[PDB]
Amino acid sequence: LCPSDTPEGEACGLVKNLALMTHITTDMEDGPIVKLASNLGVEDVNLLCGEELSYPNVFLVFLNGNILGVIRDHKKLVNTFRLMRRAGYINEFVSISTNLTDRCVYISSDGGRLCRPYI
């Protein structure tokens, strides 16, 4: 968003303006996202309650807000999806992000996310 383009008065920071090189995303199907998630390594509903806990190697994959299993190695998952997206097998817009404070990786195929390109 533009930092300096805003009204003043009632809407001093409540009516923003999009910047130049942005792109709002549209929705898509979640088929190949799940299909690559379950190959790359995830498992849920068979794991003992204890697993998903303070143990470091339990990053739990979340897609669009629904848990899709847990991965022992977060890096392989974030990196492999990212190489796959760059290769073009997964839609360019989908984003894999990782929060290490709470071990949840976050595959978002939401549609409506503010996006932008980088080199």
Q: Which residues bind other proteins (CB under 8 A)?
A: 1, 3-4, 6, 8-10, 12-13, 35, 38-41, 43-55, 57-58, 60, 65-67, 70, 72-73, 76, 80, 83-84, 87, 97, 99, 101-102, 113-114
Q: Which of 1, 2, 5, 15 binds RNA (CB under 7 A)?
A: 15
Bridge partner list, 114 = 24
Query: For residue 58, which of 79, 41, 83 has the smallest C-alpha distance?
Result: 41
Please provide residue 50's backbone torsions phi and psi, each rounded to the nearest 5 degrees: -60, -40
13 binds RNA (CB under 7 A): no
Whether the CB-CB separation of 105 and 97 falls below 8 Å is answered with yes
Which partner from the list RNA, other proteins, none does 20 bind, CB cut-off 5 to 8 Å by kind? none
